[PDB]
Structure 1
Amino acid sequence: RRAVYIGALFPMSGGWPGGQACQPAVEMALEDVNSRRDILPDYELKLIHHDSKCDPGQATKYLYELLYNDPIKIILMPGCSSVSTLVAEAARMWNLIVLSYGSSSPALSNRQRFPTFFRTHPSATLHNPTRVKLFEKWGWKKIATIQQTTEVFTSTLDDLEERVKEAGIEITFRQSFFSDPAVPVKNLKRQDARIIVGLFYETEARKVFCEVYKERLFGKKYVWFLIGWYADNWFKIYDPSINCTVDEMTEAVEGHITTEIVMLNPANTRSISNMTSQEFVEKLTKRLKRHPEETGGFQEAPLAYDAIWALALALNKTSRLEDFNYNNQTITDQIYRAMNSSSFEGVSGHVVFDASGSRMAWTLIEQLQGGSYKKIGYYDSTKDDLSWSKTDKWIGGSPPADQTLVIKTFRFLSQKLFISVSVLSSLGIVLAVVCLSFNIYNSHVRYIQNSQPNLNNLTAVGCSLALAAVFPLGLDGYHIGRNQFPFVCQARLWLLGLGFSLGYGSMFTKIWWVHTVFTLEPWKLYATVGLLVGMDVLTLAIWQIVDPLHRTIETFAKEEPKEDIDVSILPQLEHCSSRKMNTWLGIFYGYKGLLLLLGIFLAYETKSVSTEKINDHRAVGMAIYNVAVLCLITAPVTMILSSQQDAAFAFASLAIVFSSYITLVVLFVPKMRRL
């Protein structure tokens, strides 16, 4: 039989040692293809393998060695991505065919630059339909990346940032380094990101995790995304090129998320080589020497096993290959046309390398807990299948987030300060009405000798409606303050406008008469008093129906609650006010205060006698002086104090209660005196 030759590069060390599991596997394939008499009746295949570490220097040297040695070769079988790209770019001047098996760069899909390139490894954009899904379950919108500046990761990051634009999520911070990552990690710590996705090699993984330990960028509020085809114990080896220790990585890599792609048919079929899948697994694990858990590149063996069978079937399809030069075209195009139209079934399911890539479907997701690997859940891309298993263990049983801020309205002491005021009002509100009743039924000669009780019923009704005004004053957003809050403040204002004006007028008209008499009564003064109070009623109703007080929120307080949660509280307080208040309230209080000063002037201008009507003038003068001074002292304070947590309510309530008490006692002392 004649003999043909193939060229192969097997990486056995460096950033991705795969050849240690890949060199025997190809060596398990030739002995099976050279034993079946169907596919090759008069030819043998031989292999020329060389180590490269996928470094471009040794790769260039051995490529020069292969292209200018004896005998003449037919195909090349590259390794890692930097050499696959170099051979695919350089092979256009010799008319060869490049068939890779471990490269997953998306930029190798551009057929304009790479005409004679084929691969069995799937594209690396298959992680992007997955990650967005894990971004919608936990609800995030701000992420950050860090990468090693090779185009294999730049194009994948470009595709992810292109396809994340439709789900609303947006990148915020980008970093880069070529060989020394200390300054990007320092800047990332100083910028304080929380969700980080890493794209770098294994040795740089160690040289960044000991420096993320040296910058304390881990713990409870940091999430790390990594790649999945690393070794199982890629941190438990001794490396003299670092200064970090093993427990400073054992505490550093706890709680990161890894994603990988499945690569083996889980079913039970019959392949093209009459062999199931776990028997293949058993034979491969027997041929090796170390354990399959730490042997590098163990997952990618059936791809190379089908990568040989596909070319074997192709070489049966062509079937004059002994005078093949490096400058004749008719064979390269003949084999190309035979390879473009090939599809069959092998070990990794159906093998159809003729597409735009993307012939696998599923992925696989894992997390690290306690120094052990755990499988979270599978995924399918087409039918949106998501076989969850509910085993993810966060800190505190819940994943972190970025940072938020809550909005909080203020309240006050809804029990201690309010129920006491309520019972204190209820103690007097009933005494008021029973003294009014005593004024009612006492049709008595001597009471007729005293003043006419209509002006005392006016004062009593005024003080009763004023007393019954703490309940609209104490209520807030705790119970009712949702929609009819403007009506609660309206109730306040109506009660306030009535209950003060009525009693003050009912005293003021008596003091008016007792002034003007001294130095007709049954109808003159009552009607002009009624007119004056109806005037006062009109004033409130004018700018209560044209420019009312609905609601107003005021926010002052700052950030930083400084509790155990990073959340930030923003306190506010709502109260009833119009667009303009400091004019109307001022003018009404001054116009009323002038009337109060006029009343005290009229009380001062004669205190001496009383005759034939009533003689209550000393008591009513003292009571009205007391009420006047108390109101004049209390009222301009609550306009000044805006912190109405415990001052402005308490002052007004004390004023109201003291005024009501004094009014009651002054009004219904002489009845007990005369009886």
Structure 2
Amino acid sequence: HSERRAVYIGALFPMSGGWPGGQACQPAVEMALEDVNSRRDILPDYELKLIHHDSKCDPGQATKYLYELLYNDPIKIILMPGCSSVSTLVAEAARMWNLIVLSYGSSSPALSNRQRFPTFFRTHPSATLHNPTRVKLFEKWGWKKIATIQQTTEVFTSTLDDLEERVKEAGIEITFRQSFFSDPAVPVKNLKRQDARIIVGLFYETEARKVFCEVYKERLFGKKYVWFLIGWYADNWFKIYDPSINCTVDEMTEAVEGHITTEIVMLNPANTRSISNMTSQEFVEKLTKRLKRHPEETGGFQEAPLAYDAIWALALALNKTSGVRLEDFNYNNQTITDQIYRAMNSSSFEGVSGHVVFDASGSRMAWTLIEQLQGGSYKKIGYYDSTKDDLSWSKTDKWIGGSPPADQTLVIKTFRFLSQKLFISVSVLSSLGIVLAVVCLSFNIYNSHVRYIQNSQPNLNNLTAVGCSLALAAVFPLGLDGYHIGRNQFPFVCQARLWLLGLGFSLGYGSMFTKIWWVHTVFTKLEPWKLYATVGLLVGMDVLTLAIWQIVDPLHRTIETFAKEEPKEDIDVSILPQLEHCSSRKMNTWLGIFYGYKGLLLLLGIFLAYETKSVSTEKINDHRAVGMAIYNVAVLCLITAPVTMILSSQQDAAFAFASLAIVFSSYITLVVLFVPKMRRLITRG
């Protein structure tokens, strides 16, 4: 009432420049001081007053005005700078004058350094408050690798270097980082090249209206890409005329549909009373009565609640400190400043801007409104509070495919199998063939003493039929694959089929070649043991060859992949086929020598069978038909041995050729070698 000893606040309100906040944060401060002076509850003995200067957001002028504030008549108790560069200057200087600095409009991360600015506070949150929100979405939608294109302003660099540490605590990875000055052609082209899905674009509006024209040109938008921008652009920043870009307004709307934006909630979205008995709607209505222009064309309108709440936080701190006297403050005592600092630190109240609490670094904690551009108009899809970690979703995120896209395209490794129909058909033919083989072997062994089938070497044809049966039995495991066997039992199946087919062919063609060979060598100038020992030595050398193969270079499973094909069950899925073989390190070199050895024996057999065509001998009387058996076996083997290699891929045709050659060789061999030798014994004796 009477004492009313005034307490002075020095303030710098930018009425022009990069951010004309003082055009609306200064009226909001004035009004606020009234509510602190008209209420007898807070600071009744004292009265808060305001000396202010126009800073224009130029530190060069703020330096002169800081001289005017600190070196003129009334002693200030606190400083209230606006934008961020002035705030950096003033907050570094005021350490020497023992002053508190309480900014209302600075968003730089750099100001959260408690070593440079040991007495700085602000009701405007740091720009890094967006980062806890973004991560919360990346964990909600499961994305785990991210691209970050930015403009090279220091605020954006500090924001992204905080985002890196914020994600690497959660396991997410930033795979790509690009920085540009004014023209983003190269960064966005490298993003299209590297195939980045989730993008975080940190740049101003004029840079954005160029980035997104180059995104429409490069087609980096659409159904599989999502853009995370900043929320404080104008709500029609993509529809205004701009000659620096080349994409009509009908485009540049299509490149932006569906991008998420985070902003700070400056005003309270409820309709409750603050610590000044006033709601957000009527605070806005009351401030609009002061401004001499419309709030659409006045600057700093979206920040006036922060100036109001800074005035109120200061008032409540002064009301909590004061039996400390504020009328005897001078720039050399550091105790009264410590009192005001400890009362300002532990600040918690409800203002027009919401709940007002400061960090350990003096930055205010606030809410983040998350919204999404849907059809050319932003729609609020949620809120998030980082302090108690509460995300309030509204269930309005209209995605293009129903579900949000993924961080990268998945590849499904599909195995290929031969069609089971053809396998089972050839297997049943081979089973009837092997039962015919054992029938013919039993027939030959029954009549051992007829002396007409003793003039034909009987044991040699028995060994031929046994080898034929072993080849027909080895057709079976040749068709088996990963459809039935599995990984652990694979090498046993391949090794078994190798040994069975090798021994079958060796024994059959050895028993047929020793007969042709000895008929020729007796014709040109007879004994059972020599005849048996020759085929025994032949199959023994082949057995030793296959054993050295096994021992020096075992056969093992090997997968070979194909070119990627679009499988189309989903619009965005990609699958790569795989074929499973049994192979050694150098199977082709090792198999080639064996195939050549057998081919040379087969051609030698053909020549010997044609040379000894009409010769007649009584100790072996069936060479005339053994020759035509050899001709067919050799023709089939020397033509389906290379085809099994040229068609190593297309496993169905490889199996078809190989197994049809085996079964037809077996059938014609046993027929032309045993049908006459039984027909002459059921029609002539």
TM category, shorter? 0.7 to 0.9
1:39 and 1:482 mapped to 2: Cα distance?
Answer: 81
Runs of 5+ consecutive residues of structure 2 not aligned to the other structure: none
* Pair 1:531–1:276, CA change in 2 (3 A): same
Residue by residue over 1:595-651, the C-alpha shift from the partner in whole angstroms, topping out at 9 and shown as x without a partner, is 545545654554445465563221122222332344345435645665564665454
2:373 is aligned with 1:368: yes
Aligned to 1:227: 230
* Pair 1:662–1:359, CA change in 2 (3 A): same
Aligned to 1:496: 501
* Pair 1:480–1:115, CA change in 2 (3 A): closer
Residue by residue over 1:304-341, the C-alpha shift from the partner in whole angstroms, topping out at 9 and shown as x without a partner, is 33322233344456779789888998977786677567
User: Displacement of 1:250 after TM fit?
Assistant: 2.1
Residue by residue over 1:209-245, the C-alpha shift from the partner in whole angstroms, topping out at 9 and shown as x without a partner, is 4454455443344332222344444445566887765
1:409 and 1:271 mapped to 2: Cα distance?
Answer: 63
Conserved? CA contact 1:143–1:170, under 8 Å: yes
2:555 and 2:477 mapped to 1: Cα distance?
Answer: 15
Conserved? CA contact 2:112–2:361, under 8 Å: yes
* Pair 1:166–1:322, CA change in 2 (3 A): closer
* Pair 1:478–1:287, CA change in 2 (3 A): farther
Residue by residue over 1:570-608, the C-alpha shift from the partner in whole angstroms, topping out at 9 and shown as x without a partner, is 665442222344565455445545554554565455444
1:178 and 1:595 mapped to 2: Cα distance?
Answer: 77
Conserved? CA contact 2:121–2:363, under 8 Å: no
* Secondary structure of residue in 2 paired with 1:4: strand
Conserved? CA contact 2:146–2:407, under 8 Å: no
User: Displacement of 1:495 after TM fit?
Assistant: 1.8
1:434 and 1:666 mapped to 2: Cα distance?
Answer: 15
User: Displacement of 1:100 after TM fit?
Assistant: 0.9
Conserved? CA contact 1:231–1:296, under 8 Å: no
Aligned to 2:99: 96
2:390 and 2:120 mapped to 1: Cα distance?
Answer: 33
User: Displacement of 1:668 after TM fit?
Assistant: 3.5
* Pair 1:30–1:243, CA change in 2 (3 A): farther
Conserved? CA contact 1:120–1:307, under 8 Å: yes
Aligned to 1:643: 649
* Secondary structure of residue in 1 paired with 2:236: coil
Conserved? CA contact 2:223–2:401, under 8 Å: no
1:338 and 1:597 mapped to 2: Cα distance?
Answer: 106
Higher mean C-alpha deviation, range 560-569 or range 39-48: 560-569
* Pair 1:68–1:663, CA change in 2 (3 A): same
2:556 and 2:654 mapped to 1: Cα distance?
Answer: 20
Conserved? CA contact 2:448–2:458, under 8 Å: no
Conserved? CA contact 2:453–2:677, under 8 Å: no
User: How does the TM-score come out when normalised to structure 2?
Assistant: 0.79
Conserved? CA contact 1:405–1:570, under 8 Å: no
Conserved? CA contact 1:341–1:354, under 8 Å: no
Higher mean C-alpha deviation, range 435-444 or range 107-116: 435-444
* Pair 1:290–1:232, CA change in 2 (3 A): farther
Higher mean C-alpha deviation, range 128-137 or range 344-353: 344-353
Residue by residue over 1:149-185, the C-alpha shift from the partner in whole angstroms, topping out at 9 and shown as x without a partner, is 4433332222223343444545454444555656655
Higher mean C-alpha deviation, range 567-576 or range 283-292: 283-292
2:483 and 2:365 mapped to 1: Cα distance?
Answer: 59
* Pair 1:148–1:61, CA change in 2 (3 A): farther
Higher mean C-alpha deviation, range 213-222 or range 343-352: 343-352
2:416 and 2:43 mapped to 1: Cα distance?
Answer: 90
Conserved? CA contact 2:113–2:361, under 8 Å: no
* Pair 1:235–1:543, CA change in 2 (3 A): closer
Residue by residue over 1:347-373, the C-alpha shift from the partner in whole angstroms, topping out at 9 and shown as x without a partner, is 667655483236636544222222333
2:346 and 2:657 mapped to 1: Cα distance?
Answer: 94
Higher mean C-alpha deviation, range 159-168 or range 601-610: 601-610
* Pair 1:646–1:303, CA change in 2 (3 A): same
Conserved? CA contact 2:11–2:50, under 8 Å: yes
* Pair 1:216–1:295, CA change in 2 (3 A): farther
Paired residues for 1:104-503 under 5 Å = 104-140=107-143, 142-178=145-181, 193-213=196-216, 216-235=219-238, 245-262=248-265, 272-273=275-276, 300-316=303-319, 351=356, 353=358, 355-357=360-362, 360=365, 362-381=367-386, 384-387=389-392, 391-401=396-406, 403-404=408-409, 406=411, 408=413, 411=416, 413-415=418-420, 418=423, 421-422=426-427, 424-425=429-430, 428-436=433-441, 438-439=443-444, 445=450, 451=456, 453-503=458-508
Higher mean C-alpha deviation, range 586-595 or range 620-629: 586-595
Conserved? CA contact 2:120–2:362, under 8 Å: no
* Pair 1:132–1:491, CA change in 2 (3 A): same
* Pair 1:195–1:516, CA change in 2 (3 A): closer
* Pair 1:78–1:668, CA change in 2 (3 A): same
Residue by residue over 1:4-55, the C-alpha shift from the partner in whole angstroms, topping out at 9 and shown as x without a partner, is 6655455567755655654453344233223223445566555566666645
Runs of 5+ consecutive residues of structure 1 not aligned to the other structure: none
Conserved? CA contact 2:239–2:253, under 8 Å: no
* Pair 1:599–1:176, CA change in 2 (3 A): closer
1:526 and 1:183 mapped to 2: Cα distance?
Answer: 81
* Pair 1:419–1:53, CA change in 2 (3 A): farther
Aligned residues: 675
User: Displacement of 1:271 after TM fit?
Assistant: 5.3
Residue by residue over 1:251-302, the C-alpha shift from the partner in whole angstroms, topping out at 9 and shown as x without a partner, is 2321212123445678898754456777767766888899989986566444
Conserved? CA contact 1:147–1:153, under 8 Å: yes
* Pair 1:211–1:79, CA change in 2 (3 A): farther
Conserved? CA contact 1:89–1:113, under 8 Å: yes
Higher mean C-alpha deviation, range 557-566 or range 526-535: 557-566
User: Displacement of 1:62 after TM fit?
Assistant: 6.9
Higher mean C-alpha deviation, range 529-538 or range 555-564: 555-564
* Pair 1:511–1:41, CA change in 2 (3 A): closer
Conserved? CA contact 1:552–1:576, under 8 Å: yes
Residue by residue over 1:71-115, the C-alpha shift from the partner in whole angstroms, topping out at 9 and shown as x without a partner, is 887654332223322333455677654321121323223344335
Higher mean C-alpha deviation, range 560-569 or range 365-374: 560-569
* Pair 1:424–1:55, CA change in 2 (3 A): farther
Conserved? CA contact 2:15–2:54, under 8 Å: yes
Percent identity among equivalent residues?
100
* Pair 1:17–1:455, CA change in 2 (3 A): same
Conserved? CA contact 1:232–1:294, under 8 Å: no
* Secondary structure of residue in 1 paired with 2:168: coil
Conserved? CA contact 2:414–2:575, under 8 Å: no
2:521 and 2:213 mapped to 1: Cα distance?
Answer: 98
* Pair 1:640–1:29, CA change in 2 (3 A): closer
Residue by residue over 1:417-460, the C-alpha shift from the partner in whole angstroms, topping out at 9 and shown as x without a partner, is 54554455456444444444554666895865763654433322
* Pair 1:9–1:215, CA change in 2 (3 A): farther
Aligned to 1:604: 610
Conserved? CA contact 2:357–2:364, under 8 Å: yes
Conserved? CA contact 1:407–1:569, under 8 Å: yes
* Secondary structure of residue in 1 paired with 2:452: helix
* Pair 1:294–1:526, CA change in 2 (3 A): farther
User: How does the TM-score come out when normalised to structure 1?
Assistant: 0.80
* Pair 1:435–1:360, CA change in 2 (3 A): same
1:667 and 1:241 mapped to 2: Cα distance?
Answer: 91
* Pair 1:549–1:308, CA change in 2 (3 A): same
User: Displacement of 1:550 after TM fit?
Assistant: 1.5
1:257 and 1:658 mapped to 2: Cα distance?
Answer: 69
1:180 and 1:448 mapped to 2: Cα distance?
Answer: 96
Conserved? CA contact 1:404–1:567, under 8 Å: yes
* Pair 1:619–1:210, CA change in 2 (3 A): closer
* Pair 1:583–1:260, CA change in 2 (3 A): closer
1:604 and 1:21 mapped to 2: Cα distance?
Answer: 112
Residue by residue over 1:476-511, the C-alpha shift from the partner in whole angstroms, topping out at 9 and shown as x without a partner, is 334435332212222221221222233223334444
* Pair 1:578–1:202, CA change in 2 (3 A): closer
Residue by residue over 1:107-159, the C-alpha shift from the partner in whole angstroms, topping out at 9 and shown as x without a partner, is 22334433553322333333333333433444555433344444333322222
